Symmetry: D2
Subunit: 152 residues, 4 copies
């Protein structure tokens, strides 16, 4: 715009450890599906997103835990009629690491979750105007932290 | 289209729905004037915004009651700006309200002001700026939302 | 980083170099007051913006000379908004200036005002809004740019 | 609202009302492949975009006819980006089409390609980025618009 040839986006977060393998999907035009895994005794594990990109699906990279034992869930949204209006969860320590222990996704149609352990410090991000269009974060044994790209 | 510019709004935090207020969006923030009671919650709320390099004095949004302690948060705009807003929500006399607020800038932390009990919330901003507030105030700040931009 | 909100800006049209002006960005446009001369170019330029539902009177940016004809463009904000800005640039007394302007809204066309000779320019807006003007005025409007948003 | 993000779009330039196309918006531009004829107008048009740090190959939008000369505009992304797009529109075989295009970056000028006669247009960008193209191509590029963002 004035420095780089790369577009910018509002980003909120991170929630979780304040600094696993870092990831950054970047920003897209919407969200079609979220694939995550969790363990009821620990925290969030795997995280993957199928985005919308100008009216067609774009399959995000799978960001995988270093360990197994998680329960997978597929959140398939009725895109574009259905979209996320609130993301909430919990952070807290597992084996001495601050991690994202639970996630819940509220859309204009229903609530998905919570997934994981609803113990620790709550966080929540309601969106009154705008859309979540991207995720970044880090995953080791568990999801360490994450941030969200927001746009109009 | 609507003929009016639109911006990302996050929130509300607080009661899920006093007198509603909506400052709209500006260029940045110069000063926040709020009041609080250490037994109850946040009371009055008022903001001096930046508007294209000049101050714009926002309306004073006032609680229906008094007894609050005022505080003035004067930012060194534009080198100083808010990078995280946090606080607590919980019930006061049966009403869900914003019990405390804290504002962290790239320079220091203002607060927490109010009662630090209830459900915590926090909004860190990795990329972007807060440029406006809206919400509702009765006896106390019932809820609030924030305008975000690049 | 900057602590100040950012907006897309397109332009400038005119001289690629008077007294510079920059209104910054607002919520929308309520009224444009400009002056022109049918043998030279655009002279004075002033805008009443919308700012979160209330009018905001921009500074009057005036030519160094007189002899211009004023026109007031009062828009039915917010149902009426600009969807295309067009005009001409060309030399006057050796200076590259904005010689004419026309504003097309979703309701009507205002103009062209001034001299319709030289190099045409036009900015149709398929999605978005003009929310601010900047430029420079000496004897005539030397150049101008526009703030664009959603 | 809808579940789909939106961006500023300026245009169209060209015929006002072939096969329509719309690439949508991305995070930048890496390469433009177009074709032209120095007797007629712009023909084929294709873009390699940036999508979050990786190339995204846009569909090739093709003229119904041949006889065009291809050109590859390979930008040093992200150091190099477009700061002005300009061209001409005018009648070819009775159709209003985009007769020429030129792309100015912060490093160099590419073009003009095609026929530089008719009505000029130009879009300088003072702040922001072009991140997508849409339009229509028959025998020639009928019109086009550009997605703009910060």
């Amino acid at each position: 715009a004035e420095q780089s040839g790369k577009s910018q986006t509002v980003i909120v977060g991170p929630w979780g450890a304040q600094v696993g393998k870092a990831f950054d999907d970047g920003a897209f035009t919407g969200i079609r599906e979220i694939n995550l895994s969790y363990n009821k005794e620990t925290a969030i594990g795997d995280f993957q997103v199928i985005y919308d990109l100008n009216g067609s699906p774009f399959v995000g990279q799978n960001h995988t835990s270093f360990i197994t034992g998680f329960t997978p869930v597929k959140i398939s949204l009725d895109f574009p009629s259905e979209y996320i209006i609130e993301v909430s969860g919990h952070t807290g320590k597992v084996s001495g690491y601050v991690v994202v222990r639970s996630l819940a996704f509220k859309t204009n149609k229903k609530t998905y979750g919570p997934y994981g352990v609803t113990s620790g410090t709550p966080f929540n991000l309601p969106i009154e105007n705008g859309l979540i269009v991207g995720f970044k974060g880090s995953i080791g044994y568990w999801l360490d932290y994450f941030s969200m790209y927001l746009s109009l």
